[PDB]
Amino acid sequence: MLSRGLHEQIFGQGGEMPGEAAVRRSVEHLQKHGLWGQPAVPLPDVELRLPPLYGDNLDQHFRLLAQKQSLPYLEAANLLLQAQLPPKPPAWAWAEGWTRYGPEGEAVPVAIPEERALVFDVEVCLAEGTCPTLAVAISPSAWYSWCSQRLVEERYSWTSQLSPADLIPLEVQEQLVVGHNVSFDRAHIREQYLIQGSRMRFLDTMSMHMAISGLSSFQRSLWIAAKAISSWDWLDISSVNSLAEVHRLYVGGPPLEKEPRELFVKGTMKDIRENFQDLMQYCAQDVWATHEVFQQQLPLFLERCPHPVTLAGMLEMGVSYLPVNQNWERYLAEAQGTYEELQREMKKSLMDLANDACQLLSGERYKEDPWLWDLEWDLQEFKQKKAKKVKKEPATALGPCSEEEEFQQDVMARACLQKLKGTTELLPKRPQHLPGHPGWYRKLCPRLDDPAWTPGPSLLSLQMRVTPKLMALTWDGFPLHYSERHGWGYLNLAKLPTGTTLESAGVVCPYRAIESLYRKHCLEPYNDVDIPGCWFFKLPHKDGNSCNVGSPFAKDFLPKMEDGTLQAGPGGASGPRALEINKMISFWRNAHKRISSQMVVWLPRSALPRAVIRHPDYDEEGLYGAILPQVVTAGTITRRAVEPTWLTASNARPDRVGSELKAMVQAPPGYTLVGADVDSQELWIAAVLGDAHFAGMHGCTAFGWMTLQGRKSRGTDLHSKTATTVGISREHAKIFNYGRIYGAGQPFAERLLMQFNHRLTQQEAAEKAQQMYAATKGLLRKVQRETARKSQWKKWEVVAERAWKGGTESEMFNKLESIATSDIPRTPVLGCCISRALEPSAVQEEFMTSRVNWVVQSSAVDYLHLMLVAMKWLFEEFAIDGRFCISIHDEVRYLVREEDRYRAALALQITNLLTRCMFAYKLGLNDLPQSVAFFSAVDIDRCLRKEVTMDCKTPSNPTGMERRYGIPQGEALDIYQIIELTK
Amino acid sequence: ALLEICQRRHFLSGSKQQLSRDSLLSGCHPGFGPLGVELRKNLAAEWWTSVVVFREQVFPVDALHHKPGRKLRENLLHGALEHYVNCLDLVNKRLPYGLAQIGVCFHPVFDTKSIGEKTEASLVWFTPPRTSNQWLDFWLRHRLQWWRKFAMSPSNFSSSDCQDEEGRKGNKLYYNFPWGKELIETLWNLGDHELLHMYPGNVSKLHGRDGRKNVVPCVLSVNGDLDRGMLAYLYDSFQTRKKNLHRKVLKLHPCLAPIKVALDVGRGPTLELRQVCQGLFNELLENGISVWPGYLETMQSSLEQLYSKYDEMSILFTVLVTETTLENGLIHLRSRDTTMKEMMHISKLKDFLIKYISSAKNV
Amino acid sequence: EALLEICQRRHFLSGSKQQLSRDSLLSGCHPGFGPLGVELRKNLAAEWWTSVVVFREQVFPVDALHHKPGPKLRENLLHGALEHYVNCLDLVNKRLPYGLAQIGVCFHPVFGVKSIGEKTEASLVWFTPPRTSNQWLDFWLRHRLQWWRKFAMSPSNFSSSDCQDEEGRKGNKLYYNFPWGKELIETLWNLGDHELLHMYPGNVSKLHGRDGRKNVVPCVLSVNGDLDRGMLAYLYDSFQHRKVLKLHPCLAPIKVALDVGRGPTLELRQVCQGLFNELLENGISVWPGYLETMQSSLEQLYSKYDEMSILFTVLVTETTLENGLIHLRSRDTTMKEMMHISKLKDFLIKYISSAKNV
DNA sequence: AGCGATACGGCACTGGCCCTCGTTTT
DNA sequence: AAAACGAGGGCCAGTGCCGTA
Numbered sequence A: 001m002l003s004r005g006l007h008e009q010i011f012g013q014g015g016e017m018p019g020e021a022a023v024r025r026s027v028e029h030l031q032k033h034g035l036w037g038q039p040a041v042p043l044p045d046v047e048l049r050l051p052p053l054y055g056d057n058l059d060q061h062f063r064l065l066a067q068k069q070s071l072p073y074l075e076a077a078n079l080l081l082q083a084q085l086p087p088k089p090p091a092w093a094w095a096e097g098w099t100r101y102g103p104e105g106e107a108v109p110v111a112i113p114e115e116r117a118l119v120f121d122v123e124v125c126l127a128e129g130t131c132p133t134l135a136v137a138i139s140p141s142a143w144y145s146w147c148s149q150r151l152v153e154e155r156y157s158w159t160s161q162l163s164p165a166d167l168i169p170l171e172v173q174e175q176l177v178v179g180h181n182v183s184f185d186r187a188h189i190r191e192q193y194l195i196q197g198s199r200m201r202f203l204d205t206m207s208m209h210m211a212i213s214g215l216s217s218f219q220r221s222l223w224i225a226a227k228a229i230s231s232w233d234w235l236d237i238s239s240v241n242s243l244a245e246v247h248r249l250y251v252g253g254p255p256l257e258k259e260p261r262e263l264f265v266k267g268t269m270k271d272i273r274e275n276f277q278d279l280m281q282y283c284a285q286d287v288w289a290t291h292e293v294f295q296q297q298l299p300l301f302l303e304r305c306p307h308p309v310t311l312a313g314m315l316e317m318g319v320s321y322l323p324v325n326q327n328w329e330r331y332l333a334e335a336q337g338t339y340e341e342l343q344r345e346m347k348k349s350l351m352d353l354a355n356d357a358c359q360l361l362s363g364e365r366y367k368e369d370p371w372l373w374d375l376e377w378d379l380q381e382f383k384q385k386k387a388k389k390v391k392k393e394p395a396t397a398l399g400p401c402s403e404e405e406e407f408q409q410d411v412m413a414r415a416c417l418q419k420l421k422g423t424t425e426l427l428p429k430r431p432q433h434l435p436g437h438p439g440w441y442r443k444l445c446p447r448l449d450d451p452a453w454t455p456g457p458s459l460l461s462l463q464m465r466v467t468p469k470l471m472a473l474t475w476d477g478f479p480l481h482y483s484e485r486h487g488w489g490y491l492n493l494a495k496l497p498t499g500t501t502l503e504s505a506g507v508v509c510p511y512r513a514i515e516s517l518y519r520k521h522c523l524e525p526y527n528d529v530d531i532p533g534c535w536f537f538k539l540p541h542k543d544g545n546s547c548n549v550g551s552p553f554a555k556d557f558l559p560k561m562e563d564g565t566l567q568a569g570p571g572g573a574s575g576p577r578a579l580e581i582n583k584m585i586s587f588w589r590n591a592h593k594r595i596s597s598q599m600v601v602w603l604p605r606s607a608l609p610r611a612v613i614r615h616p617d618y619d620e621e622g623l624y625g626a627i628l629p630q631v632v633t634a635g636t637i638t639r640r641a642v643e644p645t646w647l648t649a650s651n652a653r654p655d656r657v658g659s660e661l662k663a664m665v666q667a668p669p670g671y672t673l674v675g676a677d678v679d680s681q682e683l684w685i686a687a688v689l690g691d692a693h694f695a696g697m698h699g700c701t702a703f704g705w706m707t708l709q710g711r712k713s714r715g716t717d718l719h720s721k722t723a724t725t726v727g728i729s730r731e732h733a734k735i736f737n738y739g740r741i742y743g744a745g746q747p748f749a750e751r752l753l754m755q756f757n758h759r760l761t762q763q764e765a766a767e768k769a770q771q772m773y774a775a776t777k778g779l780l781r782k783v784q785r786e787t788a789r790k791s792q793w794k795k796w797e798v799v800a801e802r803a804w805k806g807g808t809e810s811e812m813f814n815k816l817e818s819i820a821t822s823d824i825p826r827t828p829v830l831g832c833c834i835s836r837a838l839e840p841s842a843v844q845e846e847f848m849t850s851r852v853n854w855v856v857q858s859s860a861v862d863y864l865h866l867m868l869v870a871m872k873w874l875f876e877e878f879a880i881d882g883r884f885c886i887s888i889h890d891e892v893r894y895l896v897r898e899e900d901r902y903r904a905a906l907a908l909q910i911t912n913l914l915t916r917c918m919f920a921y922k923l924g925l926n927d928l929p930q931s932v933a934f935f936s937a938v939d940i941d942r943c944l945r946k947e948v949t950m951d952c953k954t955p956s957n958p959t960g961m962e963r964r965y966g967i968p969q970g971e972a973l974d975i976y977q978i979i980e981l982t983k
Numbered sequence B: 001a002l003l004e005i006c007q008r009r010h011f012l013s014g015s016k017q018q019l020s021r022d023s024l025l026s027g028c029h030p031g032f033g034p035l036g037v038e039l040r041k042n043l044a045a046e047w048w049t050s051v052v053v054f055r056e057q058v059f060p061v062d063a064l065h066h067k068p069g070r071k072l073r074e075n076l077l078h079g080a081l082e083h084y085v086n087c088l089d090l091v092n093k094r095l096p097y098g099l100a101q102i103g104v105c106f107h108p109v110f111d112t113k114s115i116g117e118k119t120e121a122s123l124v125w126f127t128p129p130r131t132s133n134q135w136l137d138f139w140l141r142h143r144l145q146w147w148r149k150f151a152m153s154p155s156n157f158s159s160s161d162c163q164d165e166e167g168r169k170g171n172k173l174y175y176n177f178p179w180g181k182e183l184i185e186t187l188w189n190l191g192d193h194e195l196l197h198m199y200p201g202n203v204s205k206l207h208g209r210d211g212r213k214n215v216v217p218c219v220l221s222v223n224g225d226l227d228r229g230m231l232a233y234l235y236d237s238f239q240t241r242k243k244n245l246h247r248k249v250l251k252l253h254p255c256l257a258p259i260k261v262a263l264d265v266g267r268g269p270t271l272e273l274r275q276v277c278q279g280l281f282n283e284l285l286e287n288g289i290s291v292w293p294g295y296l297e298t299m300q301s302s303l304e305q306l307y308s309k310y311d312e313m314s315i316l317f318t319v320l321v322t323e324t325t326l327e328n329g330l331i332h333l334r335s336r337d338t339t340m341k342e343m344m345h346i347s348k349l350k351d352f353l354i355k356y357i358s359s360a361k362n363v
Numbered sequence C: 001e002a003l004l005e006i007c008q009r010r011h012f013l014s015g016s017k018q019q020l021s022r023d024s025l026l027s028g029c030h031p032g033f034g035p036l037g038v039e040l041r042k043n044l045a046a047e048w049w050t051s052v053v054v055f056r057e058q059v060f061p062v063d064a065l066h067h068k069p070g071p072k073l074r075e076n077l078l079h080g081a082l083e084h085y086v087n088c089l090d091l092v093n094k095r096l097p098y099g100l101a102q103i104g105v106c107f108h109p110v111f112g113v114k115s116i117g118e119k120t121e122a123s124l125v126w127f128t129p130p131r132t133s134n135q136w137l138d139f140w141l142r143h144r145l146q147w148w149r150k151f152a153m154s155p156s157n158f159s160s161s162d163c164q165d166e167e168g169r170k171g172n173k174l175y176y177n178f179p180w181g182k183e184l185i186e187t188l189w190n191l192g193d194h195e196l197l198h199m200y201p202g203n204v205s206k207l208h209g210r211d212g213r214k215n216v217v218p219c220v221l222s223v224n225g226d227l228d229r230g231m232l233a234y235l236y237d238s239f240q241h242r243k244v245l246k247l248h249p250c251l252a253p254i255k256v257a258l259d260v261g262r263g264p265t266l267e268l269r270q271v272c273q274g275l276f277n278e279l280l281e282n283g284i285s286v287w288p289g290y291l292e293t294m295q296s297s298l299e300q301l302y303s304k305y306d307e308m309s310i311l312f313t314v315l316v317t318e319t320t321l322e323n324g325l326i327h328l329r330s331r332d333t334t335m336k337e338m339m340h341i342s343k344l345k346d347f348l349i350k351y352i353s354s355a356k357n358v
Numbered sequence D: 001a002g003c004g005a006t007a008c009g010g011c012a013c014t015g016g017c018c019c020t021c022g023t024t025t026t
Numbered sequence E: 001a002a003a004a005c006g007a008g009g010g011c012c013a014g015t016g017c018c019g020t021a
């Protein structure tokens, strides 16, 4: 009730728009495809009083909202654009705090620069960071230069107090701060760390540059290479995200000079004061270039992204906030400890293996070793020079008692010793590495004159290329090797000859110990090359490999390590345990720098909501603080968030060490976070882009009917339906689907599905051939399918027809290509054109996949912006405290309070509903399906995570530490209206 | 189960043949050798460093072996509990705080009538009831970590969570011997019962300032058998397939290793400026590193003989002084972990040893 | 006197009210020791083992059982060292005369009913040929006397007495002046082979060791020192309106203590924790008085740190958080000095190393 | 026209510039 | 006695595989 899925709505009375012929074609298509076995399972309709609409449509609703939410900031930006610039001061003031430079650049001591808008670029001595040291900010009125307290030589103690720069004005509109990578500067603002607030928002010129004339990483790679027939036309219309480059692109003035010494990251605080004026000047150049770039970018951005939703969305997306406490420090210490322990064990075992294998140097018995014969095995003993002379060989030149009368013979032996000592020092010069030990052992050791010297062979690895060959047996064989690729593995007769000859002089290669090792292995070039495993003699070539890349080293083959082949020796279960150790510290190895250096400002009990103090938690001399995620507002593609740490933060896995990083963001007492994850966005997006193109309704496609049919709650989604084929649940099927939509390569889907399902290649290939029915079909000499009924003809002139191309049957890639064919904005819906470097006008463009992905992912990001502005609209209109936002592409979490969590979840549901209705309205009709209108899962708890129930590794016990629990949601939250008076 | 000959040949134990697993695990053994008591010495010192020194609020306690009121003490926990008040006075009633002591205990054993003594290192940790379990888990992880290092295979040492007959939580530590796991250290959380029984009169002298309030201290306790531990490291040090070539050597950690370096005389014979060996000797012992003197000798044999003799004694390095070194000043050196000849300078050798041990203590 | 009362309040001895007398201290009956006393004894035993490890050629450390092997507690520390003689003959390769040192807790009956007392003594059993036994006995006499003389504030306080009998041909006993009564501190006897020949008959062909192509059953030297009596000796030797114990720097339990001066601030605790770790990193015993919790006076604080025999007292004021300067204060001179916090470690280490002389 | 896509880092390995020292030169 | 050329090791940026969302 009715039309195969709709809810009670007041978003337009009319309406149909029937399309009888169109729906006849859709019905016939879905009959021959064919799907006509409806389950007839009506979802429980919801009757609630919707918030007041402003009219006429929801388009003008979101438009007016986004406009009134970004109006003061647009005003401030306009104040920056028409700003008449006063010249730089002749000298910079060396005083703490802010210094105003107005008429003729005089020095006027100021605590806080009171301006509507300004540019900003903060400096910070990395040598003892992460505390700000210098800052420069220009305004439409005059200049400002801020110095930190680092003007007096003391022995400071950095616990990250409220030392960051003060920028916000007190009450007892309003602010806008622009800058290149503005999030980094925001992180150094004094009043941005508070629980409440804030009025001040930020505008990033880097993100704006990315939105206007951005380029993909693949493009960046060959852009900087400038130092595929028409792939070099966009080279001068776009640039990399660097400040100098973006300035050379948008301003095109003289090349700004960068600091040649990199004193802020290479030097200490000492050499900074020696070059204070110069560094100040450089910072000024930076904020000035940033100013110009902004001035040139704002109108371009406003032109290319006309809808205000993107503007306000980008405004709220830049003011993220992560509250934390001492548990953060404890997490750091514990995780680092665990990591150091596991690494200690691993390196201990490996160096143990490396020590007992060094003994077979004497005498020349290493040549027999089928693993250790490639490396050095050197024996050095250098050096000395003659100075003593002459002509005499220096190479050969039981009595019981009780004497002690020679009391001072000890100091005689001592004197002789010291006198002998200080006469040999001038014989050598520079202490080289240990020559006695073989070369492979020298390389596997730290230098003697190294400040971080550890005894024995260090630098063991995991993932090196010497140690895996040092011990491991090789796939029912003996030797492993590397040249262009390591041991071949994972990611009508054929013959190949053989040969064996000697000529001298090369390294000796054994091949009998190999055969004998094979004999010992089966004690429990051809043949045995297909499925079994064996190594030849020399050659070296492929002669039976599946992967076209190689894998040094095998670090994700645990099921291929705990099933016999392959194994290690010596010996036992040391192999799979080593792989386990590698798997555990894999995350913390490539992230510990980002996590430990992740700064955090602790706010004192004087500058925090006293309503939290009233709440029965302090907690026991506990410190409460926070950290701003420091996120680039818009990075390719499309204008997604870009953050070094929190966007690549590992989930809750009982295997990984720092797997708790996500659940360490604990909300302050009295407060709680309420968030949600769209399930699913891009799939339903592609679905809509299909059905809206085919006809008017949402279920008039083969692909678009299955997306909005399944429920994740005690049911089966499309991803889950493909995961139960079987099939692998569930993320793998998601990768398979989303990988299929953006180019279902036959070998890619092959090795992928074969990697995830673990079976034989034939049946797998059958499954793929069954699943490749979706993309089929498609379009002198050519593919045997055209616009004509038959391809065979004689001298038939038809070059005017070979301009159409599109798939058939199930999928809807034709529309995704339709948006990828337009040489004009290509912006659905909304509705923002991107990159002068990917726009097919004056571009080959040969970047199709990136553009299909651009379409759907842009729909996803506009979905995100819509969610942001929608959530912001009813959070200020109603009494919902805590508006701070924390978004991760699909998911989005708001820092609310314990008494306004359910109404916030209700706000999330309303938001999702309105946004879905928006995507429905932008293509027609305004009507939308049932199992897609509202969220299915709403997380409401203290720390943020994936599922409501969370286990972990490092702290072992989650609730054992001071935590709580989560709550699934749901249908019980649909009883608390948006009005304050509930329950 | 064949390294016993190495323990007898090189005295880390008694030369008596009657040294069964039972006689060693019960503590009825005739005694340890000089290298064995030195190993145990360094092990106990390594305990004292990583338990008492670095961590504050932990003070040494001297408990008696007997009672004023014949059988001796079974555990040095009670004697430490008797020194609770006085040690509360020097800490100014600031708990959590602990008392550590390494003393020999006497255990009555019915051999299937005798009594076996064994050295134990115990730490009694007086901690508030609010944070008892937390300190239990803390000490569990840290003790287990302390034992899992110094080992060539840390996988052997394990832990076991167990409850009392009443419900008190506790943890045991095992080592995997060739015949199965064996208890080496035990940790328990006594619920202030014994302290309440010892002081029935005034319980006011038992209150400890938890912070903003004085509470009755929950008594945590960790007792570690250093004999079974010494034997555990002794087995762990000794080596196991397709190695193609085997050599007898026990790989003890350079920190707890009995003799650090071994000084000898090569080429041989050379008279009479060999008094430099004495210089290097006193110089070495002055820095607190163990050095074996190879002066008066009957061998006069293959170098492999005394090399294996030093490898059976887990000696880290073998420094060789010959006449060429008497000429220039570059003595020879043979590491145990990797048997390889290496030339080096004298004071450079001293500082290399000090740095070797110091860095071995680290990561 | 007024020394036994400052050993109770500063935790050198265990808590007692009746068994605190000198007669009960001289006896093995206890009320054992306090942390300061334990550390003092540990340092003393350490220096003992150091003053015999430098001795050529080689002396092997051993441990003897406490109870009777045949079913009881030990009186002397000789038998257990005689049991490991034949075994340690192999390690010395039967080459030269050699000894066995060991420090252990021996017992002795103290006299209602009679009880049992304990004492931690350090013994050395030096096996040496009969022709060169007396000379080596005089050698050990001199070396032990000098050993007690090094850490002594006064060499005249320690004395050496000679004696002999029918069982022991020649023996020497080391006394200590209190001066409430000279007491026994260490015994040096020259027992014959009778003690050793009694536990191995026979076939006594094992006992005789090589002495320059000569087989001879070695005479036994019995060194037996008391570390508790020595502890009390140095305690009375250090006691000097002032009440300060001036124990030897190499012997003193806690050699430095650092507090704060400025009001309770976290940064002060940070700096003091840093200095704490730095000082403990180079093996320097440091008393943490920065906990603290009040820091009342300074004179009674210095009095407390002088009654605990702390060499140097360190004060970390608020200026230290600017210049790094810190307030040192000696014990033997009580001179209020000031120096940078970075050069403190080197100063303490050099000062301790400067006390190494004989 | 043919295609996983958008990122974020990490460690292992390498050819090249630069400084130091010795073998070789008035 | 004095000028010159080659060998060795560190700092540098680039590249190939892998780590995560």
Ligand SMILES: Nc1nc(=O)n([C@H]2CS[C@@H](COP(=O)(O)OP(=O)(O)OP(=O)(O)O)O2)cc1F
Pocket: A677, A678, A679, A680, A681, A682, A683, A719, A734, A735, A738, A890, D005
């Ligand atoms: N490899 C990979 N590539 C791509 O391109 N995506 C993107 C495709 S869409 C977007 C969100 O996906 P999701 O949130 O992880 O999943 P869901 O299907 O949106 O709904 P759920 O309920 O969570 O399953 O990420 C995601 C991938 F993982």
Ligand SMILES: *P(=O)(O)OC[C@@H]1CC[C@H](n2ccc(N)nc2=O)O1
Pocket: A651, A888, A889, A890, A891, E021
């Ligand atoms: P995480 O919780 O696994 O994922 C969070 C979001 C979903 C979309 C985005 N993402 C994840 C993985 C991949 N491969 N690509 C993405 O865009 O992160």
Ligand SMILES: [Mg+2]
Pocket: A677, A678, A679, A680, A681, A890
């Ligand atoms: Mg999703």
Ligand SMILES: [Mg+2]
Pocket: A889, A890, A891
């Ligand atoms: Mg997602």
